[PDB]
Amino acid sequence: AKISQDVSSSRSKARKAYFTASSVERRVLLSAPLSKELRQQYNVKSLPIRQNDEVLVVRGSKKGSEGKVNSVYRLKFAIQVDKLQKEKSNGASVPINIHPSKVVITKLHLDKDRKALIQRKGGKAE
RNA sequence: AAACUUUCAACAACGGAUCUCUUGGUUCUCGCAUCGAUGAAGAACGCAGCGAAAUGCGAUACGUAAUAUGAAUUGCAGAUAUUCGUGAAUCAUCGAAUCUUUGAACGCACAUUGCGCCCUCUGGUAUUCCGGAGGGCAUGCCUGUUUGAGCGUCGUUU
Ligand SMILES: [Mg+2]
Ligand SMILES: [Mg+2]
């Protein structure tokens, strides 16, 4: 149960804050858990998904698929994986949208800011 | 006997009830004190690579600066855009700016994009005319400055 007077248990307020979330807020909302191998490598359990991460799909019809994130399509609350494509009868392929909470990050795209973020969260980066 | 009329059932119509939802409303409580001549509230007209509206903004026009953050935006397109970084996106934050024509609305006027005057600079052979750029000119009242008015009145000299 929540104790703080600054926390709201309102369903309408919580949903409004989600669907009207800014792009910067949606980066944190689109977090993904790390795989077991990366969790012991970095001592961090989840990170906001980023463009050049590699993920393994763990839920849905594409469970077991792997690929590199192509875009964190923050407007649709989804990520698009490298070769997770649906082929229309037209012959054209549209990417399949997957929520980041339904994948595990298997390889991180690292830069000076990701490492500081991992070290900020108590982990180890380099 | 058909057709026709009426009733019922099945399927299809017409229509949008019912059910289930809900970024809305309503009411209660808690906390706070912050509009404007330093130009408000409001109005009009504009502004996007491709927009009519809503939203945002003002010729720096769906925004400029700054701080933070840290890879997007996305319907399509596109960098003389970006990725171990003064660096994508961001009304995230916001302390610097821009802020058209107006509006208490202030040169005068306004059913007009009407008409002046002053200062500096500038173009046309120009203190005077015509053009342009920038800066100014409302009213009531207060304090002060300067210039004044009145046999209202004080001193002095014929
Ligand atoms: Mg209902
Ligand atoms: Mg007239």
Curated annotation (Swiss-Prot):
Keyword Zinc: no
Gene Ontology cellular-component terms listed: cytosolic large ribosomal subunit; preribosome; yeast-form cell wall
Record keywords: Cytoplasm, Ribonucleoprotein, Ribosomal protein
InterPro entries, sorted: Rib_uL2_dom2, Ribosomal_uL24_CS, Ribosomal_uL24_euk/arc, Ribosomal_uL24_KOW, Translation_prot_SH3-like_sf
An example Gene Ontology biological process: ribosomal large subunit biogenesis
SUPFAM superfamilies in the record: Translation proteins SH3-like domain
Domain of life per record: Eukaryota
Chief localisation class: cytoplasm
Keyword Ribosomal protein: yes
Record-linked Pfam families: Ribosomal_L26
Any one GO MF annotation of this record: RNA binding
Location in the cell: Cytoplasm
Biological role: Component of the ribosome, a large ribonucleoprotein complex responsible for the synthesis of proteins in the cell. The small ribosomal subunit (SSU) binds messenger RNAs (mRNAs) and translates the encoded message by selecting cognate aminoacyl-transfer RNA (tRNA) molecules. The large subunit (LSU) contains the ribosomal catalytic site termed the peptidyl transferase center (PTC), which catalyzes the formation of peptide bonds, thereby polymerizing the amino acids delivered by tRNAs into a polypeptide chain.
Subunit structure: Component of the large ribosomal subunit. Mature ribosomes consist of a small (40S) and a large (60S) subunit. The 40S subunit contains about 32 different proteins and 1 molecule of RNA (18S). The 60S subunit contains 45 different proteins and 3 molecules of RNA (25S, 5.8S and 5S).
Family: Belongs to the universal ribosomal protein uL24 family.
This protein's name: Large ribosomal subunit protein uL24
Gene: RPL26B
